[PDB]
Amino acid sequence: MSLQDAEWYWGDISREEVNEKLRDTADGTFLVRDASTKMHGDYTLTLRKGGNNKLIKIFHRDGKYGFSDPLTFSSVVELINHYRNESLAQYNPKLDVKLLYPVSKYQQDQVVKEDNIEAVGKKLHEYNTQFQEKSREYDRLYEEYTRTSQEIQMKRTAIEAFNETIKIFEEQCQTQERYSKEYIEKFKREGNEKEIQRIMHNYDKLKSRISEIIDSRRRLEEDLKKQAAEYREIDKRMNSIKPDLIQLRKTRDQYLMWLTQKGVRQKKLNEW
Amino acid sequence: PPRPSSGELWGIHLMPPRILVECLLPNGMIVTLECLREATLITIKHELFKEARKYPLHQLLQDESSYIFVSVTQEAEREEFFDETRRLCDLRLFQPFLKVIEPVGNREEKILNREIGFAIGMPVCEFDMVKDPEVQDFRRNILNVCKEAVDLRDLNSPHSRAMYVYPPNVESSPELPKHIYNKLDKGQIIVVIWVIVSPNNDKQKYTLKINHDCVPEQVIAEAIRKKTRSMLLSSEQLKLCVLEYQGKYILKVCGCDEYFLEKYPLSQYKYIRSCIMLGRMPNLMLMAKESLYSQLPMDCFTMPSYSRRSTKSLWVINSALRIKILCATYVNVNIRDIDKIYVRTGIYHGGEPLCDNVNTQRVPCSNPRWNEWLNYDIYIPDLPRAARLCLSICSVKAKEEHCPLAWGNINLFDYTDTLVSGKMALNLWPVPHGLEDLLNPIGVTGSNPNKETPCLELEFDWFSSVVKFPDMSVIEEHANWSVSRLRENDKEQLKAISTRDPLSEITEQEKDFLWSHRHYCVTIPEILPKLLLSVKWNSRDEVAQMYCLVKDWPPIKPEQAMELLDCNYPDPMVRGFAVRCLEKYLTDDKLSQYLIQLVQVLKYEQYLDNLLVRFLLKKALTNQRIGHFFFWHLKSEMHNKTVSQRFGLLLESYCRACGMYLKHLNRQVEAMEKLINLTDILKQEKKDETQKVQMKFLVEQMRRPDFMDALQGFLSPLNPAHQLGNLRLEECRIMSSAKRPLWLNWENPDIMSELLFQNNEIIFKNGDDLRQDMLTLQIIRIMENIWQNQGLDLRMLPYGCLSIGDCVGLIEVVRNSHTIMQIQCKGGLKGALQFNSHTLHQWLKDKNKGEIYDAAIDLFTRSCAGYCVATFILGIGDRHNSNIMVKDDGQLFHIDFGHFLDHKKRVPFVLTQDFLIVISKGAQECTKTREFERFQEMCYKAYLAIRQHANLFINLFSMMLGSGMPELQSFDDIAYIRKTLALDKTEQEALEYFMKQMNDARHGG
Ligand SMILES: CNC(=O)c1cnc(Nc2ccccc2C)c(NC(=O)c2cc(F)cc(Br)c2)c1
């Protein structure tokens, strides 16, 4: 019935660290530290409620405990377990959850085999090597992902420019036929095939060039189609590497548990 | 590495001297015209219609003068070339062709929009196509802010116009501190006035001794009084010529374009406040006012074309909030590595969920469809106005692993105060690098314009009619309704909470204790940010009651009001109160100082039209100094599609009303474009070529006339007061870094350039994210300003640094300075392959022979103490000798902060033995002398001096969270400064904490 050995007391843990432990958790998940003020015998309880991490200060006086001006309990373990049994709406109706889910310090200690020191000096260096390699691949993916992303929009605006040029050459064809039809028809009955072939020679050269830019557009739309697909492939590959990267980063992290078995960081200093 | 234009033609850097242009006539004839690269369109059109006579149907062509050219730019714009003076090669043509049309519409408007487009980097016509009514309303509704500013600065012409272009560069207070005052000769300053005489622009000087607080006109009075000494003038004849000169001349700083146009005390002008601080001689040039106003050409402001041409309340809806998630699209996920996907959602007010999150069911990757109505634990009337929907698509993968795939945020109310209804579809954004939270409530609200990106479809409840947020009328009455449903020891605790920093822990007992005494809080207005975080924003009762308190809140000063513009205070009433504090307490000096953060928090704004943007835009158009950097900070982020529209519209309005300065900005933009294109060529094409082959491409490319005409004779973006004249091509070069930045050197064309600096050299770097150095160098300037005002004469060197785009910008060169590694190499090896530790001290002695030796040691010890404290606090301590520099003067300063932040992925700060030699003047056991004794006393005083202003810095960094800098993605990143400043400990505990770090900084002691 001691506080130091209790499940939900972690000790010198930082606020940013508990925020990293109640992330997306359920209402009622709770955890206590010694206050960030670093003052002896002064604590803070933080519990999940409404998607928020709500902190409360555990006051201490005359050896008693509590978190309001009227102060009662003998130990924090009595203060907590009381609110594990029934709701803390007694303190404040604005929040009415029980201290349902504790998060403990030395559960999730997922090292199972014979605890030879090589579980650190060997399997830690292994996971950390596996972590920095996969972390280097994800950084490489994100580099060519952003490179491909910008080359795509460069092409999307270039084909959009081709669209405007082709729109302007097509209206040129539709105005060539509008203003040349009845000059062709007039030249036809005057027997002036010479002038008819000047107009046709120029018209042929018009839609000869429009064919070149039309071909240049599809040749770019082809490069775009194929780079847009390799872009989606880079995306799904990153999405596959992210959860793995997090999994073996947490494994590398908790394999410092068995470094903490020695406490003094000699067994990682050797790898330094 | 995209670009508004990589060259004069698509995929081509420069046009050959002669190229063929396809000309499309108003008859269907196509004419190939061979024309010079530099041919003006006037020459093209004339020679085209001269050649057209050789082609059929010339009879149908009107007169040459009745047509203009139209073509397609590399931005995909069909541009009408009204300004026929431009060279063919400047058009940014996609393909070399020209379509002949009859001009239509306002010529002057079309020529002006093209110039704006070149300035902001995108065509203005793209805004015309936007469906969004918020966009079109913004374009029209801030034109009155433009009219206000133009009318205000054209009021008392030409003076008011000169005050806009050449605003006084002054400190925020005339009260100079005693350590500055003591360098005055019995409260006076000696100044030299210069005059130019015509026959050969020969010049003469007049030395004066005057009270430090003389106004510029009084300086002109003492100068004419000193020259009329022997003219035997009566008291009234002296007045008449004093009056003549006071009203006919003004004073200018020799060497740059700064002027003394307003009657601040002379010592309040920054140039002279530093001449006193540095003990240098202020050199001023007397100049005719009619000459200054001559270089201020009149500039109009014309309203553009677009400028001119039932519902129930939220508090009646008796139902809880629910939102329908339909389906997704374009989700990129490996179907065999990922088990299932789902949509995560939350209702947020700032960064605090108004209610618990809710998720859709999990669904196979191959069929992203849900059709689920998600129910939220919040009563619709309890919604605050600034409520937002934050969502994302997540994957799950044997302990589970959840990861976000794409995110998106939505304002539950739009800019018209209406509640969204009906089916909605928004394209999501990529999850930023390093973010692992399933949601991103700090990201911008809006749909991603990029195509083939995951599109999520939703539907909101329709309540038979349009729903609107209640007017302020009923909100106050609901407060009168709920309020119906002194003390001592509590007084000291409330004040005890105002002291605590913006990021300090605030427990439940403390915040509802504030909410209880919320009415006593207006006696300590500094508590407002803490009280606002205490309001339960999912209760319309409390919010309404809070609205009434902020409506009558006492103004807090800007350093505190800026916190209320960060991402934790999204309510429009709170943010409106913060703006009103700035526009009545924020000087243009400290506006320009904090401009980086003020532009940045525009990203947090819920809508385009808001009180903050109108304030910044107002000030940017009434002060061209802050309007310069206002433009460049907005321009530097145009590439970022999350803000390219907000900033683009904002830049459009500025460029449309900034006046003749747009012409100058376009010369800067074109100069940068030429430099960024040459570096791109050096980085993409001839990266494999040798460094001398690259040098010859540089020396040859810079000699081209079109390049020199563009890079010679324009204002420095680092400081528009500095003119950049001719290039000293002899001194230009590529540098050693892999990105090969350009070392550029210009002549200073000022008439008296020799009195300041005769040549000005800047580093242009393309490929490095420079905004980390901007924020660091800015922060260093803040700390130096704090120390100077406290009396600590610790000299820092926040050299100029400006980001102009995606990983590209300018850096100011510090003359007569070397790295500590460079200085070690000027000496010899003392130990076994070990540089001599005394080499730094010996080099400094050689540069400061004689009586000036003590000054150099004092300057080194002071500048060193400054950077030791600064770098420790900011976690920038463990620097390499090549990243620390020192002037011949003895001034020490650090460089390349972005390199350090990147190289990250152990010592509190660099206090090497070499520095201790200099500090102790070359003594044995230098850590036990009395020079070192008072050196660490400077460090102690400087540390607790910054801790005494810890709130300002924490707020400055907090406002940068939405920037996109990976160093600033969450408030947890800012916690580091709370550790170094030891804000959860007392002064003596923080002092002792820093003292232990200093003992460890000297690597043992
Ligand atoms: C070996 N170094 C570290 O471990 C380290 C850890 N946390 C940090 N956070 C931190 C601290 C104070 C202020 C702001 C931040 C973001 C920093 N400092 C920066 O990242 C930083 C500092 C700037 F001045 C400017 C820019 Br931009 C970024 C360093």
Side-chain angles (χ1 to χ4, degrees):
Chain A
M1 307 174 188
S2 59
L3 187 160
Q4 182 63 33
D5 305 315
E7 288 278 293
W8 34 258
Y9 177 71
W10 290 63
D12 186 5
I13 298 302
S14 60
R15 183 196 188 179
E16 287 68 25
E17 220 167 335
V18 297
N19 290 338
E20 185 166 12
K21 285 160 174 49
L22 294 182
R23 194 182 303 190
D24 304 325
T25 56
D27 287 6
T29 45
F30 69 100
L31 198 173
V32 320
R33 330 153 295 169
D34 54 327
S36 301
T37 303
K38 275 259 178 173
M39 184 160 56
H40 189 276
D42 200 358
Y43 304 85
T44 56
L45 158 67
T46 66
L47 61 154
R48 189 78 171 174
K49 157 53 62 183
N52 289 281
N53 310 331
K54 308 183 72 55
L55 303 99
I56 73 95
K57 191 180 194 296
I58 292 173
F59 289 86
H60 170 255
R61 183 95 74 162
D62 301 330
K64 297 142 184 174
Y65 290 88
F67 46 78
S68 185
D69 204 2
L71 209 139
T72 305
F73 302 79
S74 66
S75 178
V76 180
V77 303
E78 186 188 356
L79 172 60
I80 290 291
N81 279 281
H82 170 78
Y83 290 117
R84 294 195 68 185
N85 176 239
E86 55 190 17
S87 176
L88 41 56
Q90 295 177 0
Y91 160 73
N92 179 14
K94 203 65 162 283
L95 77 174
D96 57 359
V97 75
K98 288 183 292 189
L99 301 185
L100 292 163
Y101 296 82
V103 292
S104 59
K105 190 167 185 174
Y106 276 102
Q107 217 66 1
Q108 78 160 12
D109 58 331
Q110 307 308 128
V111 188
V112 185
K113 208 161 188 174
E114 180 83 55
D115 60 355
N116 296 345
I117 187 58
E118 62 191 322
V120 179
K122 188 185 292 178
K123 183 62 67 167
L124 178 70
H125 168 270
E126 173 179 337
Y127 280 129
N128 183 71
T129 300
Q130 200 179 18
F131 159 75
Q132 67 183 16
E133 190 286 323
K134 184 154 286 187
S135 179
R136 183 175 170 95
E137 183 186 22
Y138 173 70
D139 281 1
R140 178 171 67 175
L141 281 167
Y142 187 84
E143 287 296 343
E144 60 176 330
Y145 178 71
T146 47
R147 171 174 76 82
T148 309
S149 190
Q150 79 205 342
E151 292 187 13
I152 283 169
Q153 83 176 25
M154 284 198 293
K155 291 174 176 175
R156 289 193 189 278
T157 52
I159 62 168
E160 191 66 4
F162 271 118
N163 291 344
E164 286 290 354
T165 66
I166 292 167
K167 255 184 63 54
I168 291 167
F169 276 65
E170 284 175 348
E171 69 180 35
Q172 189 67 3
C173 293
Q174 292 179 355
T175 50
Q176 197 283 349
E177 298 177 344
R178 182 183 314 287
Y179 294 116
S180 73
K181 152 60 193 178
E182 279 166 321
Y183 283 91
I184 292 287
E185 196 175 52
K186 181 171 176 293
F187 287 135
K188 104 182 177 58
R189 62 190 305 164
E190 299 173 1
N192 195 337
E193 184 63 25
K194 169 170 66 69
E195 296 298 335
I196 288 173
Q197 288 301 326
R198 294 176 68 209
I199 295 171
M200 291 302 299
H201 179 266
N202 193 274
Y203 189 18
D204 284 354
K205 187 156 74 177
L206 169 57
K207 54 186 179 177
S208 174
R209 175 135 302 288
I210 209 182
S211 188
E212 295 192 2
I213 72 180
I214 287 168
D215 174 71
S216 298
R217 180 175 64 172
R218 58 145 289 272
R219 183 167 51 182
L220 185 61
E221 292 181 303
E222 184 176 12
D223 293 3
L224 203 178
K225 229 193 296 295
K226 300 177 178 182
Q227 187 173 40
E230 95 185 16
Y231 177 72
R232 296 181 62 192
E233 288 295 312
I234 295 164
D235 194 12
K236 64 177 65 164
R237 291 161 76 95
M238 292 192 307
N239 290 327
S240 302
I241 272 73
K242 274 183 292 186
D244 293 355
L245 195 156
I246 293 174
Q247 177 174 349
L248 50 66
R249 178 231 270 163
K250 288 191 173 188
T251 302
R252 185 269 287 175
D253 292 332
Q254 71 155 238
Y255 265 63
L256 302 179
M257 283 188 183
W258 269 256
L259 172 143
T260 309
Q261 285 281 11
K262 191 172 183 64
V264 63
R265 71 209 321 115
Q266 163 72 90
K267 289 292 175 184
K268 179 61 179 182
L269 177 59
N270 176 262
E271 188 54 29
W272 277 50
Chain B
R3 188 72 20 72
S5 174
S6 301
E8 301 170 347
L9 287 173
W10 183 55
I12 288 163
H13 177 212
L14 298 174
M15 296 178 173
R18 290 161 174 267
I19 56 166
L20 301 173
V21 179
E22 309 294 338
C23 294
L24 311 185
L25 294 170
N27 60 20
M29 249 51 56
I30 178 165
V31 181
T32 51
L33 206 78
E34 184 192 341
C35 39
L36 296 309
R37 164 183 170 273
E38 305 79 359
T40 176
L41 287 185
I42 286 169
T43 295
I44 301 296
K45 199 171 73 182
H46 183 266
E47 185 165 344
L48 170 62
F49 280 67
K50 172 192 180 97
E51 182 72 355
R53 290 170 177 263
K54 298 177 183 171
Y55 288 73
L57 288 69
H58 174 268
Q59 297 81 16
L60 298 175
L61 300 181
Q62 290 195 42
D63 178 71
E64 170 186 339
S65 63
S66 63
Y67 299 114
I68 62 167
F69 285 125
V70 70
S71 187
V72 173
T73 63
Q74 294 166 20
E75 312 181 35
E77 177 189 13
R78 191 180 78 104
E79 183 180 312
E80 300 158 279
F81 302 137
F82 283 94
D83 187 359
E84 315 192 58
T85 68
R86 286 194 285 160
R87 294 121 41 84
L88 172 69
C89 52
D90 303 350
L91 271 49
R92 297 138 76 86
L93 290 182
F94 183 63
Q95 295 285 265
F97 81 95
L98 300 169
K99 166 66 170 173
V100 178
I101 63 166
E102 294 183 38
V104 298
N106 186 14
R107 167 187 167 89
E108 278 60 33
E109 185 192 37
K110 289 279 178 164
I111 293 175
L112 189 269
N113 284 347
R114 169 263 153 178
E115 294 174 355
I116 293 179
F118 189 90
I120 72 178
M122 57 171 291
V124 179
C125 56
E126 297 191 357
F127 300 133
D128 301 331
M129 286 292 300
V130 176
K131 302 149 56 180
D132 192 348
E134 187 184 359
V135 169
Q136 302 303 341
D137 281 0
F138 177 93
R139 295 184 79 192
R140 300 184 303 100
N141 286 5
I142 59 159
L143 288 169
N144 54 72
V145 177
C146 298
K147 186 179 178 296
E148 284 178 17
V150 173
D151 292 350
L152 181 55
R153 72 183 197 231
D154 296 357
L155 182 60
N156 305 115
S157 300
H159 178 74
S160 63
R161 308 187 57 244
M163 289 284 287
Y164 163 65
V165 180
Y166 303 116
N169 191 17
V170 291
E171 302 283 7
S172 288
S173 181
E175 182 193 324
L176 68 182
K178 58 188 295 181
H179 90 276
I180 301 294
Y181 181 95
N182 292 345
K183 292 198 173 186
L184 300 173
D185 183 12
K186 34 91 174 188
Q188 293 194 324
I189 182 176
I190 185 169
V191 60
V192 60
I193 282 64
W194 292 82
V195 189
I196 270 63
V197 55
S198 307
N200 193 46
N201 284 337
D202 297 329
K203 31 214 177 298
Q204 316 182 238
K205 74 187 188 182
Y206 300 81
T207 55
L208 281 62
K209 187 179 293 190
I210 53 175
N211 295 335
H212 73 87
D213 54 349
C214 287
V215 302
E217 280 185 11
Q218 285 172 346
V219 180
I220 295 172
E222 274 286 357
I224 197 72
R225 180 184 305 156
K226 173 163 181 161
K227 181 155 212 296
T228 57
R229 192 204 311 258
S230 301
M231 296 194 69
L232 307 177
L233 296 177
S234 58
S235 308
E236 197 60 25
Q237 277 290 305
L238 173 59
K239 279 177 175 289
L240 257 64
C241 56
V242 165
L243 265 286
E244 179 181 17
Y245 275 63
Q246 278 177 343
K248 174 164 154 46
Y249 296 96
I250 40 70
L251 287 164
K252 174 190 173 297
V253 178
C254 297
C256 68
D257 297 359
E258 279 198 0
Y259 299 86
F260 297 77
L261 303 185
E262 187 57 291
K263 59 190 178 185
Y264 293 91
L266 188 69
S267 61
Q268 193 174 356
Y269 280 85
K270 295 197 178 186
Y271 169 66
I272 296 178
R273 179 72 64 89
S274 76
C275 281
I276 302 161
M277 187 189 304
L278 282 53
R280 201 144 63 193
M281 185 70 134
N283 279 252
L284 305 178
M285 173 179 172
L286 188 76
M287 174 177 171
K289 290 168 76 172
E290 53 270 22
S291 291
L292 180 63
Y293 304 156
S294 179
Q295 57 189 64
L296 293 176
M298 240 296 288
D299 46 8
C300 61
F301 160 79
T302 55
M303 290 292 193
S305 53
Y306 61 80
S307 64
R308 39 178 172 260
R309 294 180 53 79
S310 185
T311 73
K312 59 181 71 185
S313 167
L314 178 86
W315 286 2
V316 320
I317 305 299
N318 177 31
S319 64
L321 180 67
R322 62 170 201 163
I323 308 176
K324 205 183 193 179
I325 281 60
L326 279 55
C327 62
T329 330
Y330 286 96
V331 176
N332 298 319
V333 66
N334 193 20
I335 296 174
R336 53 194 61 84
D337 282 323
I338 298 300
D339 299 327
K340 301 184 190 300
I341 54 170
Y342 73 96
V343 180
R344 168 155 275 257
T345 68
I347 315 300
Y348 278 83
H349 181 265
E352 176 146 320
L354 291 164
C355 61
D356 199 359
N357 305 94
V358 297
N359 313 143
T360 65
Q361 289 173 117
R362 301 182 183 180
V363 158
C365 296
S366 55
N367 181 238
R369 176 170 271 96
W370 294 272
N371 298 100
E372 290 189 18
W373 274 102
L374 302 179
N375 293 278
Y376 300 87
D377 182 3
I378 188 162
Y379 197 57
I380 287 176
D382 282 328
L383 262 50
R385 170 55 191 277
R388 291 152 74 252
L389 164 64
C390 306
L391 51 72
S392 65
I393 305 177
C394 297
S395 61
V396 301
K397 194 199 72 164
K399 167 64 216 317
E400 215 133 51
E401 295 288 352
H402 296 217
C403 292
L405 311 179
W407 66 270
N409 298 330
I410 291 162
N411 303 312
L412 295 183
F413 302 90
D414 63 351
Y415 75 109
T416 69
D417 315 328
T418 60
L419 185 75
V420 297
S421 292
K423 64 179 182 178
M424 182 187 300
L426 75 167
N427 295 259
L428 304 176
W429 302 91
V431 63
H433 198 210
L435 185 70
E436 292 173 342
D437 303 61
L438 302 181
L439 292 175
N440 184 37
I442 62 97
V444 302
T445 61
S447 175
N448 178 11
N450 294 326
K451 301 297 178 297
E452 298 195 314
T453 58
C455 177
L456 183 67
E457 304 191 13
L458 303 84
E459 179 172 5
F460 297 83
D461 263 319
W462 166 253
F463 307 87
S464 73
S465 74
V466 173
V467 184
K468 265 205 174 75
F469 197 84
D471 289 307
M472 190 61 57
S473 307
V474 61
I475 299 176
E476 296 208 22
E477 181 59 17
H478 187 93
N480 299 335
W481 182 93
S482 184
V483 70
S484 300
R485 289 178 167 264
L486 54 137
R487 302 92 187 277
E488 166 47 47
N489 166 245
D490 308 325
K491 195 86 171 187
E492 83 192 341
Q493 163 163 254
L494 292 167
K495 189 70 175 182
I497 292 165
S498 297
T499 67
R500 317 213 282 121
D501 63 294
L503 269 51
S504 53
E505 292 182 12
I506 180 170
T507 67
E508 292 300 330
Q509 305 108 317
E510 305 180 39
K511 52 200 302 180
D512 63 0
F513 162 74
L514 281 162
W515 183 240
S516 303
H517 301 73
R518 60 189 180 274
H519 299 280
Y520 298 110
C521 281
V522 284
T523 321
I524 48 170
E526 316 93 44
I527 196 76
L528 180 58
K530 316 300 196 303
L531 176 66
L532 288 163
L533 298 185
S534 302
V535 176
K536 188 86 179 182
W537 293 90
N538 66 11
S539 169
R540 65 161 177 169
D541 301 326
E542 299 189 21
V543 176
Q545 295 166 219
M546 169 53 72
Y547 275 20
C548 298
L549 285 174
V550 309
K551 190 190 185 185
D552 297 330
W553 204 269
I556 56 180
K557 40 190 168 191
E559 279 72 12
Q560 295 152 359
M562 284 192 296
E563 180 186 355
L564 302 178
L565 288 325
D566 70 14
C567 60
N568 279 348
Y569 306 91
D571 183 295
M573 307 307 297
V574 175
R575 302 181 73 82
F577 162 84
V579 172
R580 289 192 298 272
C581 284
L582 303 187
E583 67 190 336
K584 299 293 163 189
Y585 289 68
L586 185 63
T587 67
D588 288 9
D589 162 52
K590 298 211 262 98
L591 185 302
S592 204
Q593 183 79 277
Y594 309 136
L595 183 56
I596 293 169
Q597 290 73 15
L598 293 167
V599 166
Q600 208 75 97
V601 297
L602 290 171
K603 302 191 174 184
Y604 310 145
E605 287 298 339
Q606 207 165 7
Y607 316 108
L608 299 175
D609 193 338
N610 57 75
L611 290 173
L612 171 59
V613 66
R614 300 176 91 90
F615 167 59
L616 299 178
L617 191 269
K618 177 70 161 285
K619 279 287 178 178
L621 292 174
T622 51
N623 180 325
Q624 204 185 269
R625 186 184 68 246
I626 71 191
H628 169 85
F629 297 99
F630 177 74
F631 165 93
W632 272 114
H633 290 156
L634 292 171
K635 175 69 152 60
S636 68
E637 302 209 45
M638 271 289 102
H639 60 273
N640 189 332
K641 257 59 178 60
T642 62
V643 296
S644 63
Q645 180 168 259
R646 183 194 294 271
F647 287 4
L649 297 167
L650 182 54
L651 282 167
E652 184 196 17
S653 62
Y654 172 80
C655 297
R656 194 173 299 283
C658 70
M660 266 289 299
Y661 192 53
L662 178 59
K663 298 283 188 291
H664 294 84
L665 290 167
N666 278 332
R667 280 196 61 84
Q668 300 172 35
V669 174
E670 183 173 33
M672 305 321 299
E673 175 177 294
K674 290 291 160 71
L675 294 177
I676 204 178
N677 283 340
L678 298 199
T679 45
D680 281 356
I681 290 165
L682 290 161
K683 291 167 65 258
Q684 80 195 359
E685 297 191 27
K686 302 201 166 185
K687 180 68 166 63
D688 181 56
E689 299 290 345
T690 69
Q691 205 172 28
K692 179 55 181 170
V693 169
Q694 285 179 301
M695 190 67 71
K696 287 303 304 301
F697 175 76
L698 180 73
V699 83
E700 183 176 40
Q701 190 66 230
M702 296 180 71
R703 160 254 306 287
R704 292 199 319 103
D706 290 8
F707 177 96
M708 293 193 300
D709 291 358
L711 264 293
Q712 297 185 137
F714 76 108
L715 307 181
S716 172
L718 286 172
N719 187 340
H722 298 336
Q723 298 194 13
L724 301 175
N726 292 342
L727 280 163
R728 294 201 174 202
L729 299 174
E730 321 92 45
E731 312 298 328
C732 298
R733 49 175 274 273
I734 48 163
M735 298 184 66
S736 56
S737 183
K739 286 150 272 277
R740 282 159 169 71
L742 295 176
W743 183 288
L744 296 175
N745 181 308
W746 292 266
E747 291 181 17
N748 182 2
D750 191 315
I751 314 104
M752 314 194 69
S753 56
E754 60 273 18
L755 295 178
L756 190 65
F757 46 80
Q758 198 161 351
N759 54 1
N760 184 8
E761 49 198 347
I762 307 169
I763 294 170
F764 170 85
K765 181 150 65 167
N766 172 14
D768 269 346
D769 192 16
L770 300 191
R771 55 194 169 157
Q772 283 79 9
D773 291 70
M774 270 180 58
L775 178 56
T776 309
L777 291 160
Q778 184 210 23
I779 288 285
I780 287 166
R781 193 166 60 238
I782 307 307
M783 290 184 289
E784 185 188 43
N785 174 267
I786 286 168
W787 290 330
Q788 287 292 336
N789 278 280
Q790 284 204 352
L792 280 76
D793 189 10
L794 302 187
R795 288 260 296 279
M796 312 296 285
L797 216 170
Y799 53 88
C801 177
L802 176 65
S803 177
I804 66 175
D806 188 10
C807 298
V808 56
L810 300 163
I811 304 174
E812 182 187 354
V813 172
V814 180
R815 306 213 86 243
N816 308 121
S817 67
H818 301 88
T819 65
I820 276 53
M821 178 59 65
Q822 284 170 352
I823 291 162
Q824 280 182 348
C825 295
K826 286 181 178 295
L829 298 170
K830 180 169 172 178
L833 293 82
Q834 285 288 300
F835 286 112
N836 181 8
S837 177
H838 291 256
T839 189
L840 176 63
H841 184 207
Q842 291 162 4
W843 171 85
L844 193 57
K845 285 196 297 176
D846 181 59
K847 288 286 189 167
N848 297 269
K849 296 179 178 182
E851 296 165 14
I852 58 175
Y853 167 74
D854 287 328
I857 301 297
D858 184 23
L859 178 53
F860 182 95
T861 313
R862 284 176 133 83
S863 62
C864 183
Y867 275 88
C868 287
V869 171
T871 56
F872 164 70
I873 290 166
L874 303 171
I876 307 297
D878 192 6
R879 304 312 308 277
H880 184 260
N881 278 331
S882 72
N883 303 122
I884 304 181
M885 298 193 70
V886 66
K887 282 171 70 83
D888 306 7
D889 193 12
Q891 180 175 0
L892 178 148
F893 62 102
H894 293 207
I895 64 157
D896 298 339
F897 302 106
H899 187 59
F900 172 87
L901 278 316
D902 270 324
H903 185 253
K904 172 169 172 55
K905 291 295 296 188
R906 173 62 182 267
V907 69
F909 53 89
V910 170
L911 182 52
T912 183
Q913 187 66 10
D914 305 10
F915 299 172
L916 297 170
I917 306 310
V918 181
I919 292 165
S920 295
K921 297 184 183 182
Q924 295 285 10
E925 59 174 5
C926 41
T927 53
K928 278 289 180 180
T929 189
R930 288 129 75 192
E931 284 80 13
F932 178 87
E933 178 182 322
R934 63 182 70 101
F935 156 75
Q936 62 181 0
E937 210 259 329
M938 285 186 290
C939 290
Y940 302 163
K941 292 181 69 177
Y943 172 81
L944 59 88
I946 300 307
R947 180 184 152 99
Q948 288 161 6
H949 293 76
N951 311 272
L952 172 57
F953 294 99
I954 287 170
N955 286 337
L956 291 178
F957 286 111
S958 299
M959 297 163 79
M960 304 295 292
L961 289 171
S963 60
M965 283 182 283
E967 298 78 8
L968 294 148
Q969 290 291 263
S970 59
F971 290 95
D972 297 359
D973 294 327
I974 309 177
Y976 188 97
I977 205 179
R978 303 193 74 259
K979 188 182 183 72
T980 57
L981 296 177
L983 298 177
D984 294 332
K985 301 181 172 73
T986 66
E987 276 198 301
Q988 291 298 320
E989 289 145 37
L991 215 169
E992 291 170 7
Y993 164 69
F994 179 62
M995 286 193 290
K996 199 200 82 169
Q997 294 289 43
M998 190 158 188
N999 303 334
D1000 306 335
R1002 57 231 216 187
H1003 322 111

